[PDB]
Design an enzyme around this catalytic site. Structure first.
Site, PDB file in Angstrom:
ATOM      1  N   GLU A  35      39.805  59.486  53.542  1.00 41.64           N
ATOM      2  CA  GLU A  35      39.366  58.078  54.197  1.00 41.64           C
ATOM      3  C   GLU A  35      40.750  57.764  55.121  1.00 41.64           C
ATOM      4  O   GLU A  35      40.163  57.479  56.220  1.00 41.64           O
ATOM      5  CB  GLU A  35      38.818  57.212  53.260  1.00 41.64           C
ATOM      6  CG  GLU A  35      37.661  57.650  52.363  1.00 41.64           C
ATOM      7  CD  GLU A  35      36.445  57.664  53.435  1.00 41.64           C
ATOM      8  OE1 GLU A  35      36.478  57.597  54.590  1.00 41.64           O
ATOM      9  OE2 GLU A  35      35.183  58.329  53.035  1.00 41.64           O
ATOM     10  N   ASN A  46      32.754  52.856  63.598  1.00 44.25           N
ATOM     11  CA  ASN A  46      31.763  53.897  63.565  1.00 44.25           C
ATOM     12  C   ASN A  46      30.762  53.696  64.943  1.00 44.25           C
ATOM     13  O   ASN A  46      30.826  52.813  65.497  1.00 44.25           O
ATOM     14  CB  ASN A  46      30.825  53.544  62.106  1.00 44.25           C
ATOM     15  CG  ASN A  46      31.633  53.458  61.029  1.00 44.25           C
ATOM     16  OD1 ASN A  46      31.542  52.629  60.246  1.00 44.25           O
ATOM     17  ND2 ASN A  46      32.397  54.579  60.719  1.00 44.25           N
ATOM     18  N   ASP A  48      27.925  53.175  65.040  1.00 43.92           N
ATOM     19  CA  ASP A  48      26.806  52.129  65.012  1.00 43.92           C
ATOM     20  C   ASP A  48      27.336  50.951  65.284  1.00 43.92           C
ATOM     21  O   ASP A  48      26.641  49.941  65.178  1.00 43.92           O
ATOM     22  CB  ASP A  48      26.056  52.311  63.746  1.00 43.92           C
ATOM     23  CG  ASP A  48      26.863  51.960  62.421  1.00 43.92           C
ATOM     24  OD1 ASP A  48      27.976  51.651  62.589  1.00 43.92           O
ATOM     25  OD2 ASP A  48      26.276  52.197  61.527  1.00 43.92           O
ATOM     26  N   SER A  50      29.686  49.718  63.370  1.00 44.01           N
ATOM     27  CA  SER A  50      30.287  48.974  62.121  1.00 44.01           C
ATOM     28  C   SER A  50      31.700  49.607  62.311  1.00 44.01           C
ATOM     29  O   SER A  50      32.043  50.420  62.876  1.00 44.01           O
ATOM     30  CB  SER A  50      29.695  49.486  60.977  1.00 44.01           C
ATOM     31  OG  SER A  50      29.507  50.731  60.717  1.00 44.01           O
ATOM     32  N   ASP A  52      35.015  50.904  59.565  1.00 48.50           N
ATOM     33  CA  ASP A  52      35.567  51.211  58.293  1.00 48.50           C
ATOM     34  C   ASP A  52      36.888  50.756  58.048  1.00 48.50           C
ATOM     35  O   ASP A  52      37.806  50.869  58.868  1.00 48.50           O
ATOM     36  CB  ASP A  52      35.740  52.663  57.848  1.00 48.50           C
ATOM     37  CG  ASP A  52      34.111  53.383  57.888  1.00 48.50           C
ATOM     38  OD1 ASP A  52      33.080  52.479  57.766  1.00 48.50           O
ATOM     39  OD2 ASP A  52      34.068  54.726  57.961  1.00 48.50           O
ATOM     40  N   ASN A  59      33.029  50.127  54.750  1.00 48.49           N
ATOM     41  CA  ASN A  59      32.240  49.963  56.095  1.00 48.49           C
ATOM     42  C   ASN A  59      31.641  48.378  56.116  1.00 48.49           C
ATOM     43  O   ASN A  59      31.289  47.921  55.168  1.00 48.49           O
ATOM     44  CB  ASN A  59      30.995  50.911  56.279  1.00 48.49           C
ATOM     45  CG  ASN A  59      30.798  51.184  57.675  1.00 48.49           C
ATOM     46  OD1 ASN A  59      29.778  50.386  57.799  1.00 48.49           O
ATOM     47  ND2 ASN A  59      31.404  51.996  58.380  1.00 48.49           N
ATOM     48  N   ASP A 101      26.830  51.398  43.599  1.00 53.55           N
ATOM     49  CA  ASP A 101      25.388  51.051  44.630  1.00 53.55           C
ATOM     50  C   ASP A 101      24.383  51.947  44.356  1.00 53.55           C
ATOM     51  O   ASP A 101      23.391  52.000  44.865  1.00 53.55           O
ATOM     52  CB  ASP A 101      25.966  51.134  46.156  1.00 53.55           C
ATOM     53  CG  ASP A 101      24.722  50.484  46.813  1.00 53.55           C
ATOM     54  OD1 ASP A 101      24.194  49.298  46.508  1.00 53.55           O
ATOM     55  OD2 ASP A 101      24.662  51.162  47.900  1.00 53.55           O
TER      56      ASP A 101
END
Length: 129
Positions: A35, A46, A48, A50, A52, A59, A101
């Protein structure tokens, strides 16, 4: 901060990630490795919008607030900036939530693609834990 492999393993263990949700420390180290390359300050936008953040590339789409991810949640109730700390507590606490999650560490794309199923123990090999 760029952790060393064992240093990060130790810190992760220290913050109770070892075996957290059944993911051995090697997994978390492995996830961190791919990561962020162990760099707490790693941030990556990202597609989109967002971003990280941090050693585990948490994120802002879901987990932290960076104030620029419309419609995002902040489920770890932290600014994403907290996820870039040299002290990994925030990232860990947040990772704990993330890995709880429901999809386990698959939440970490790099972990799924690069760590899952591999000899993740190699990541803690030699570490005085």
């Amino acid at each position: 901060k760029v952790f060393g492999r064992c240093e990060l393993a130790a810190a992760m263990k220290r913050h109770g990630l070892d075996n957290y949700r059944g993911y051995s420390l090697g997994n978390w180290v492995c996830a961190a490795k791919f990561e962020s390359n162990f760099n707490t300050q790693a941030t990556n936008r990202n597609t989109d919008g967002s971003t990280d953040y941090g050693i585990l590339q948490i994120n802002s789409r879901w987990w932290c607030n960076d104030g620029r991810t419309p419609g995002s949640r902040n489920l770890c109730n932290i600014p994403c900036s907290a996820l870039l700390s040299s002290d990994i507590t925030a990232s860990v606490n947040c990772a704990k939530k993330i890995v709880s999650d429901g999809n386990g560490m698959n939440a970490w794309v790099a972990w799924r693609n690069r760590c899952k199923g591999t000899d993740v123990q190699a990541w803690i090999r030699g570490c005085r834990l």
